[PDB]
Design a protein around this ligand. Structure first.
Ligand SMILES: [Mg+2]
Ligand SMILES: [Mg+2]
Ligand SMILES: [Mg+2]
Ligand SMILES: [Mg+2]
Ligand SMILES: [Mg+2]
Ligand SMILES: [Mg+2]
Ligand SMILES: [Mg+2]
Ligand SMILES: [Mg+2]
Ligand SMILES: [Mg+2]
Ligand SMILES: [Mg+2]
Ligand SMILES: [Mg+2]
Ligand SMILES: [Mg+2]
Ligand SMILES: [Mg+2]
Ligand SMILES: [Mg+2]
Ligand SMILES: [Mg+2]
Ligand SMILES: [Mg+2]
Ligand SMILES: [Mg+2]
Ligand SMILES: [Mg+2]
Ligand SMILES: [Mg+2]
Ligand SMILES: [Mg+2]
Ligand SMILES: [Mg+2]
Ligand SMILES: [Mg+2]
Ligand SMILES: [Mg+2]
Ligand SMILES: [Mg+2]
Ligand SMILES: [Mg+2]
Ligand SMILES: [Mg+2]
Ligand SMILES: [Mg+2]
Ligand SMILES: [Mg+2]
Ligand SMILES: [Mg+2]
Ligand SMILES: [Mg+2]
Ligand SMILES: [Mg+2]
Ligand SMILES: [Mg+2]
Ligand SMILES: [Mg+2]
Ligand SMILES: [Mg+2]
Ligand SMILES: [Mg+2]
Ligand SMILES: [Mg+2]
Ligand SMILES: [Mg+2]
Ligand SMILES: [Mg+2]
Ligand SMILES: [Mg+2]
Ligand SMILES: [Mg+2]
Ligand SMILES: [Mg+2]
Ligand SMILES: [Mg+2]
Ligand SMILES: [Mg+2]
Ligand SMILES: [Mg+2]
Ligand SMILES: [Mg+2]
Ligand SMILES: [Mg+2]
Ligand SMILES: [Mg+2]
Ligand SMILES: [Mg+2]
Ligand SMILES: [Mg+2]
Ligand SMILES: [Mg+2]
Ligand SMILES: [Mg+2]
Ligand SMILES: [Mg+2]
Ligand SMILES: [Mg+2]
Lengths: 61, 70, 118, 263, 188, 595
RNA sequence: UACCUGGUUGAUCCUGCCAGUAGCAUAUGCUUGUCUCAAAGAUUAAGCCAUGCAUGUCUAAGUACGCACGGCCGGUACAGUGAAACUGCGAAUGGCUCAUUAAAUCAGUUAUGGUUCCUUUGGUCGCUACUUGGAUAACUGUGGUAAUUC
RNA sequence: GACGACCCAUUCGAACGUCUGCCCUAUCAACUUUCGAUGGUAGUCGCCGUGCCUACCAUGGUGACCACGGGUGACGGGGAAUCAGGGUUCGAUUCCGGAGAGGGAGCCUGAGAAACGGCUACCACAUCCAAGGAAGGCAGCAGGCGCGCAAAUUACCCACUC
RNA sequence: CCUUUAACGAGGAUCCAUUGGAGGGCAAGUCUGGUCGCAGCAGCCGCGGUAAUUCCAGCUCCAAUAGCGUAUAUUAAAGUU
């Protein structure tokens, strides 16, 4: 005996709606595209030191 | 002579031929003798014993489980 | 260090600046910072003077008077449009608005207009 | 340390009738400011995900509430920490069901589905009667509602039944010896009985006696009495058990003799 | 510092005050040998549970009869003691609780009941049977020789449905000594 | 774990009323041996470096805040990230590769610097201790959990991180790799970025030139271009400053600076000249013993690190007693009372060329018992005229062959010697004044025994330029022609070697003609300076000889640089190429002061 | 489990302590196969700190002339997604530590009929007008300083 | 529908008050008072009551039932170890309350701060400098030096709780 | 990681249990060699001066056991607050 939990959605649009995104990615319906938390962090802290169009970090990393 | 205070005490090196493991000007870790303030046994004026010679215990050197680092 | 109006000296001094002053930009609601500034009296020791022309002379300067001007941006509020083009109190102000031209090559030609407020 | 108001609530300090665990996490819903006090309310997230199991996390109850499905006292609440309280009406018309938050017997709220014709009014206890500008009489009820122009024979501690759609006080019961009541605080939190006495101590905490439908008597403070009927006749529908508080021995006898294990 | 953890735990035994007492020593060794226990901590454990039961019983026994608390907690302790079978249903009163002995709880272990019910050839065989997953209580396979067997559960002890001793594929020894006929004398 | 000693010189430490309690409370000074020799005097409190055990006792019983506590660093299995064999060099730990910025490394010869770059490249599995038979990457992944190097190495192994390494030498592989003219451009990783690099870096003059007809500065610019045109993310430049002229170094620093921003980790080896304040971001220092062990310290900001490591005594956590003032030769010594006679010469105005290098010298003065150095951009004919005056060709219009035997030190050190350097220690022989000359060159701090017997092929650049040094002053000769000694030598090394050449050609009353590219050596090697002017490979008129001051001040005014002294270190720094501290120095012609 | 044992004497009976005995929590020594749970720079220096990160934020609904993309043709509140910047809100919560502090803090008990309270919920909203004024961001362009979120 | 808004009530609080409760010390027996100590009248200031502060009066207030002074390797409590019955010792530490951000001090914005992931000075440290100037606060999470008998990774993630 | 599962995986010589002790208090040897008031042991009483039940070792045995010893704070023993 082995026990778990199951859900049956009345459609695929409602199933694409609620559905925590990590569970959709268990069968291809979603794809978490980013790199790394520390990259997102250190980038944001460089963007904080420039004013106006932040070309060096919205484009040039 | 103790590091944190600078006081000068007298300590006991208990075993057969364990005084050979203790040169001069090497730091040793001492503990109490077992009566919390008093001289134990037939020894006058002594209240502590030596338990470590240089980061290595006097009971591993007494059984050969270790050796001094030089 | 920048010069600022009404610091009546030819020396350099430290002032406690707040919002609304010049030579300072706040970083937080209510912040005030002590900053160095130069007095407004002109002197031999500047790096630059900023000079504006008020009355034009006779001979065109070969570098800044030969060129032309642009409209840049048009007026965006309706009353400014009226006062600019001298319309009446009932004059249908939705057609005298400036159309900005574009045509960055590789895209079709085009015109924009700002949304009118009030 | 504490220069202003707080906004977090620790799971160990939350009210006990929420019946929470101690291993999910350090934090609790912390109901937002509303018409009911913090220690006497029941947030929406706890009522939906814990007692009804409709949701499984906080995201699910957030996206249930963000679809305009839940109505508390007629109006549509979108907040998931709204402090729902005593004698309130929940309405979920996508499934056609209405509830009513009332303490059952053991000092905690029950799940008390009611008929749609009963989910139209609610009973309210009067706390204050003052006069505004131009001599207009006002009311203040136990859930912050204010009523202008009540009939000038309703006073404090009396109960008024109000229409949920329009306000507009409909009828009222008077605080008198012989009237059904439910206790809403203290040790007898949930028990129902008739008054039969009211002891008076000028300056502090006039106490009131009660005697339920089996000859048991218990007292409380006047601040916790709630008249809910004229006498031996409730105006709202009573839950299962009807605030009788059968002792632990009778509890065990009825749980064993009935052998209530499953179907 | 704040964490979602629990720190509740306790000891389950107590050492004896007199460390070297010949009578206590040999009495606890008699008890270890006849029930096939591993340690003396496993005797001090049962002693601790019996002492706590006795303390609770004597505590309830000093209240006056007709006290609701005494009635409730006594009728509960008695029922819970009969549920494991260390008390006769014909006694069922707080006076008989102070007559129990340590070998009423050591009797009711699973290792004892597996030998005593006849699935094993000794208690020292029974411990290695239980600890090697051969024994099943209803549908559950129980790995633990200290599993205190309730009363109604007494009928249901037998062998695991996938184990050599009853409806099971033979172990790795009967399958290489058999492979000896094929891969030990037929292929090598 | 370490050794502990005390530093005592601090604010107004006076044994006048200190009551000398330092010696009153020491275990070592009581047992008989001399540790703290301080009595009521007019002296600064004395302490030894080897006699005090430490134990902090002398610190806890002083009334005035004089005595402190410091460490001496030595190996005791500090995670030993790489070992080679028994009694052989070991590295301890590496910095995390700071992304989006220049992480520099500043260190000496011997101590670990190439080993770090090789491991950070993924090319070398770090030994982490004792040997694994295969190079097992599971060691580095399991040893460094809980750190950022775990993810970095796991992403190295998945092919997503492409690393590029600079060759530590340009002279090691003009033998195996060969590239055909024109096609050498088309073979590179990209087409449109070649123009941007060649235009900013100045390969433009020589892209279509014969690759064998080039000089060493063009080979460095070619290596630079070939490395930068390859798109990757990890980039290692093992001393890109090595034998480039100062404005070449500046534009190469600007071109690698142009590639910091788009998330590509760049690690440069950086015993560099004083151009610091826009050309590297964080720096890390190196500690250890050159022939035995090394460690890299935590990352520091560039100015902070240069200053505390140029002071030596300032770093806050940990210390080492070395790195005295070594950036220059503040120890002034000059006196010439023996120079009663001299044997001067006068060369005519020879002008030569091979196929495209127009060269022309002016007849000038050729002194004796005195030195002369020349300078200029690479390609103005500095080795060309040297070895043509030694003699290769053009006996057509005048010409005086050196009647003197000539000592000669090349820049292209790559000997073809089967055997060892102990052999060529006998082709030329030390049968000469056996007094300290080589033991005062290097005997105590550098162990010249490593240069007596070694493997000639695996020798480091330092010891290579040192056998280049020893090739000169051991052969019977009277005129020294030394070309680019400063290469693969660090600050003290460069200075000590140049000074050795100076006062060893001084006492024997002979002449030296020096080639240089680093300002500090061009200053402290001569009083006469010939300026090399002209556009490379079009016309480079070798200027008439002059003195040092006018020569240098007319030379560097053609590069648009200037140098600023330092009031506390006397260490010359560049300005920004315009600044309010530079503008007046430029119009006044003085590019250095405090003579 | 409401418990004692050795030591003053040639031997005895006491006072009386030293030592033994069991737990508990800090350190340390030797040794360690499996599995669940899980304390952890408090003690001494509330001593000093290299480096990275820990507070930000937009819906149909405050201001869209960035050609930044982009439409079926243009802007006639003007398409649509929407960088930047102005504006509104939050940053007074949480986290950390225990130096100070002896009717002080704190705990139970009561009082504001002696006060303030963003927000939430409920009451209150009538004694040129078919819509007013000028002026700063972003953006464009010229710069200053060794150097900064100038 | 969204947003905004004077006033009242409700909610979340905050602040100031009532009664009772405290470790060792007499080698601490008298303490407090124009440098407000206790009370009275009028005011200033404060969100409000109030010597909170000012002017003018009165001479009061506390103590052997331990006041006043000193010490604490003292943050308080819910609680922890041991325990026949009574007790003894511990509580820096995950919940509640208080206090602080190297030491003092003064303020801006704001409903709410005497805020330090805010500002302004002095003291103590300490960083860069082109010597004119500029910049700082890990008793937050990792990490490092020092101190010691004595205490962990410069990791991954917002999937759970909020 | 655990749990579920394949395929391999034990003869006892290794897929090798330690920490303290054996005069008394206090469970366990007047067994054999070495030292000879020395080395050392010993919380206390006490062991060692040529026939040592206590030292150094070998063998044997006792206690708890994946744990056991030591220094210190504190509680019971203490009806020695
Ligand atoms: Mg368009
Ligand atoms: Mg508008
Ligand atoms: Mg807080
Ligand atoms: Mg909330
Ligand atoms: Mg006597
Ligand atoms: Mg005797
Ligand atoms: Mg004792
Ligand atoms: Mg397993
Ligand atoms: Mg601390
Ligand atoms: Mg930092
Ligand atoms: Mg938008
Ligand atoms: Mg808000
Ligand atoms: Mg705010
Ligand atoms: Mg901590
Ligand atoms: Mg005091
Ligand atoms: Mg009080
Ligand atoms: Mg309280
Ligand atoms: Mg209170
Ligand atoms: Mg409202
Ligand atoms: Mg008054
Ligand atoms: Mg008054
Ligand atoms: Mg008096
Ligand atoms: Mg006092
Ligand atoms: Mg005091
Ligand atoms: Mg304290
Ligand atoms: Mg206390
Ligand atoms: Mg008790
Ligand atoms: Mg506490
Ligand atoms: Mg403390
Ligand atoms: Mg802590
Ligand atoms: Mg409180
Ligand atoms: Mg504070
Ligand atoms: Mg500090
Ligand atoms: Mg606000
Ligand atoms: Mg502050
Ligand atoms: Mg804070
Ligand atoms: Mg700041
Ligand atoms: Mg901080
Ligand atoms: Mg930290
Ligand atoms: Mg944390
Ligand atoms: Mg240490
Ligand atoms: Mg520890
Ligand atoms: Mg440590
Ligand atoms: Mg989350
Ligand atoms: Mg775990
Ligand atoms: Mg043994
Ligand atoms: Mg022994
Ligand atoms: Mg023996
Ligand atoms: Mg014994
Ligand atoms: Mg015995
Ligand atoms: Mg003998
Ligand atoms: Mg013998
Ligand atoms: Mg005691």
């Amino acid at each position: 005996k082995t026990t778990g939990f199951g859900m049956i959605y009345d459609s695929l649009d409602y199933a694409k709606k609620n559905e925590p995104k990590h569970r959709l990615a268990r069968h291809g319906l979603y794809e978490k595209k980013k790199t790394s938390r520390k990259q997102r962090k250190e980038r944001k802290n460089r963007m904080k030191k420039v004013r106006g169009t932040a070309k060096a970090n919205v484009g040039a990393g | 002579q103790l590091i944190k205070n600078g006081k000068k005490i007298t300590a006991f090196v208990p075993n057969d031929g364990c005084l050979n493991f203790i040169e001069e000007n090497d730091e040793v870790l001492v503990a109490g003798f077992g009566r919390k303030g008093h001289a134990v046994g037939d020894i006058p004026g002594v209240r502590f014993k030596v338990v470590k010679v240089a980061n290595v215990s006097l009971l591993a050197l007494y059984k050969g489980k270790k050796e001094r680092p030089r | 260090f920048p010069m600022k109006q009404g610091v009546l000296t030819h020396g350099r001094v430290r002032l406690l600046l707040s919002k609304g002053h010049s030579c300072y930009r706040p970083r937080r609601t209510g912040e005030r910072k002590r900053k160095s500034v130069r007095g407004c009296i002109v002197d031999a020791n500047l790096s630059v003077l900023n000079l504006v022309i008020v009355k034009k002379g006779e001979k065109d300067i070969p570098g800044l008077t030969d060129t032309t001007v642009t409209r840049r941006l048009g007026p965006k509020r309706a009353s400014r449009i009226r006062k600019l083009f001298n319309l009446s109190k009932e004059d249908d102000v939705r057609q005298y608005v400036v159309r900005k031209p574009l045509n960055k090559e590789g895209k079709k030609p085009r015109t924009k207009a700002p949304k009118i407020q009030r | 340390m504490a220069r202003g108001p707080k906004k977090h609530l620790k799971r160990v300090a939350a009210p006990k009738h929420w019946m929470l665990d101690k291993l999910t996490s350090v934090f609790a819903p912390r109901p937002s400011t509303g018409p009911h006090k913090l220690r006497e309310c029941l947030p929406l997230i706890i009522f939906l995900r814990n007692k009804l199991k409709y949701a499984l996390t906080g995201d699910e109850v957030k996206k249930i509430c963000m679809q305009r499905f839940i109505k508390i006292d007629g109006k549509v609440r979108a907040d998931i920490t709204y402090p729902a309280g005593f004698m309130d009406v929940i309405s979920i018309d996508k499934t056609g069901e209405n509830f009513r938050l009332i303490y059952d017997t053991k000092g905690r709220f029950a799940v008390h589905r009611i008929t749609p014709e009963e989910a139209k009014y609610k009973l309210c206890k009067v706390r204050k009667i003052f006069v505004g500008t131009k001599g207009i009489p006002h009311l203040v009820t136990h859930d912050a509602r204010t009523i202008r122009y009540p009939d000038p024979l309703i006073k404090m501690n009396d109960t008024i039944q109000i229409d949920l759609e329009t306000g507009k006080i409909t009828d009222f019961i008077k605080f008198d010896t012989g009237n059904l009541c439910m206790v809403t605080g203290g040790a007898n939190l949930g028990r129902i009985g008739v008054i039969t006495n009211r002891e008076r101590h000028p300056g502090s905490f006039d106490v009131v006696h009660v005697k339920d439908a089996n000859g048991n008597s218990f007292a409380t403070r006047l601040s916790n009495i709630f008249v809910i009927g004229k006498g031996n006749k409730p105006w709202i529908s009573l839950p299962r058990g009807k605030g009788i508080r059968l002792t632990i021995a009778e509890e065990r006898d009825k749980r064993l003799a009935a052998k209530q294990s499953s179907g | 510092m704040p964490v979602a953890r629990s720190w509740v735990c306790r000891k389950t035994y107590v050492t004896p005050r007199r460390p070297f007492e010949k009578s206590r020593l040999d009495q606890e060794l008699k008890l270890i040998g006849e029930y096939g226990l591993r340690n003396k901590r496993e005797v001090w454990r049962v002693k601790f549970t019996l002492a706590k039961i006795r303390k609770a019983a004597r505590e309830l026994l000093t209240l006056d009869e007709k006290d609701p608390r005494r009635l409730f907690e006594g009728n509960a302790l008695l029922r819970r003691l009969v549920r494991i079978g260390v008390l006769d249903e014909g006694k069922m009163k707080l006076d008989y609780i102070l007559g129990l002995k340590i070998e009423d709880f050591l009797e009711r272990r699973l290792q004892t009941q597996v030998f005593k019910l006849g699935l094993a050839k000794s208690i020292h065989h029974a411990r290695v049977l239980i600890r090697q997953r051969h024994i099943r209580v209803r549908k559950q396979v129980v790995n633990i020789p200290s599993f205190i067997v309730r009363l109604d559960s007494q009928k249901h002890i037998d062998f695991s449905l996938r184990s050599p001793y009853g409806g099971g594929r033979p172990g790795r020894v009967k399958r290489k000594n058999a492979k000896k006929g094929q891969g030990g004398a037929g292929a090598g | 774990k370490l050794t502990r000693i005390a530093i005592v010189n601090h604010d107004k430490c006076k044994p006048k009323k200190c009551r000398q309690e330092c010696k009153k409370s020491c275990p070592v000074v009581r047992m008989g041996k001399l540790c703290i020799e301080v009595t009521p005097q007019s002296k600064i409190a004395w302490i030894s470096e080897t006699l005090c055990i430490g134990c902090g006792i002398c610190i806890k019983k002083c009334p005035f805040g004089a005595l402190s506590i410091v460490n001496l660093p030595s190996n005791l299995e500090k995670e030993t990230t790489h070992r080679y064999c028994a009694n052989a060099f070991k590295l301890h730990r590496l910095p995390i590769p700071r992304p989006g910025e220049v992480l520099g490394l500043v260190g000496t010869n011997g101590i670990g610097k190439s080993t770090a770059l090789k491991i950070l490249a993924g090319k070398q599995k770090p030994n982490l201790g004792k040997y694994d038979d295969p190079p097992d990457w599971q060691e580095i992944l399991t040893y460094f959990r809980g750190s950022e190097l775990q993810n970095y190495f796991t992403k190295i192994l998945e092919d997503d991180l492409k690393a590029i390494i600079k060759p530590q030498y340009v002279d090691q592989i003009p033998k195996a790799a060969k590239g055909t003219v024109g096609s050498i451009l088309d073979r590179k990783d990209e087409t449109k970025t070649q123009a941007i690099v060649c235009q900013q870096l100045d390969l433009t003059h020589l892209k279509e030139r014969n690759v064998e007809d080039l000089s060493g500065g063009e080979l460095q610019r070619f290596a630079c271009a070939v490395v930068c045109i390859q798109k990757a993310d990890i980039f290692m430049f093992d001393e890109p400053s090595s034998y480039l002229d100062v404005k070449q170094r500046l534009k190469a620093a600007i071109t690698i600076r142009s590639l910091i921003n788009p998330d590509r980790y760049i690690i440069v080896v950086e015993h560099d000249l004083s151009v610091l304040d826009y050309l590297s971001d964080f720096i890390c220092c190196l500690y250890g013993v050159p022939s035995a062990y090394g460690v890299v310290t935590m990352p520091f900001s560039v100015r902070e690190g240069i200053n505390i490591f140029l002071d030596g005594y300032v770093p806050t956590e940990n210390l080492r007693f070395r790195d005295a003032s070594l950036v220059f030769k503040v120890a002034e010594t000059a006196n010439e009372e023996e120079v009663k006679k001299m044997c001067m010469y006068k060369y005519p105005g020879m002008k030569k060329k091979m196929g495209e290098f127009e060269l022309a010298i002016v007849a000038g003065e050729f002194t004796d018992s005195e030195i002369m150095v020349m300078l200029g951009e690479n390609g103005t004919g500095k080795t060309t005229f040297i070895r043509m005056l030694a003699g290769r060709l053009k006996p057509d219009e005048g010409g005086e062959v050196p009647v003197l035997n000539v000592s000669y030190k090349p820049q292209k050190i790559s000997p073809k010697s089967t055997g060892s350097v102990r052999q060529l220690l006998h082709e030329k022989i030390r049968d000469a004044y056996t007094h300290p000359q080589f033991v005062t060159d290097v005997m105590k701090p550098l162990q010249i025994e490593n240069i007596i017997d070694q493997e000639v092929q695996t020798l480091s650049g330092g010891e290579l330029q040192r056998v280049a040094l020893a090739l000169c002053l051991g052969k019977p000769a009277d005129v020294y022609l030394i070309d680019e000694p400063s290469a693969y030598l660090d600050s003290e090394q460069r200075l000590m070697a140049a000074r050795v050449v100076k006062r060893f050609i001084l006492h024997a009353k002979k002449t030296a003609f020096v080639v240089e590219h680093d300002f500090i050596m061009a200053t402290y090697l001569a009083d006469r300076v010939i300026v090399f002017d002209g556009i490379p490979s079009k016309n480079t008129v070798a200027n008439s000889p002059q003195t040092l001051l006018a020569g240098m001040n007319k030379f560097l005014s053609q590069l648009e640089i200037t140098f600023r002294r330092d009031p506390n270190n006397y260490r010359p720094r560049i300005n920004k190429l315009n600044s309010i501290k530079d503008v007046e120095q430029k119009k006044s012609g003085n590019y250095f002061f405090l003579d």
